[PDB]
């Protein structure tokens, strides 16, 4: 039930225009993950809209 958040485990810096950069610990919902290992997530922190690289995210206990 409910939704399931997500964390970054590593920083990341984008390297092209439609990706988010983000810090360790950095929250997000994720908006769509049906197009592939990029998904369009949400942030928690800055309340953007971008792909980023999804291994690089865990669910939330």
């Given at each position: 039930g409910g939704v399931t958040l997500f964390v970054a485990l590593?920083?990341?810096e984008a390297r092209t225009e439609d990706?988010?950069?983000f810090?360790?610990?950095e929250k997000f919902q994720i908006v769509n993950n049906?197009?592939?290992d990029w998904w369009?997530?949400?942030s928690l922190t800055t309340?953007?809209?971008g792909?980023?690289?999804s291994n690089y995210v865990a669910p939330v206990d």
């Amino acid at each position: 039930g409910g939704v399931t958040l997500f964390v970054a485990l590593y920083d990341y810096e984008a390297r092209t225009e439609d990706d988010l950069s983000f810090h360790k610990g950095e929250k997000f919902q994720i908006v769509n993950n049906t197009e592939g290992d990029w998904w369009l997530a949400h942030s928690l922190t800055t309340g953007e809209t971008g792909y980023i690289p999804s291994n690089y995210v865990a669910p939330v206990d």
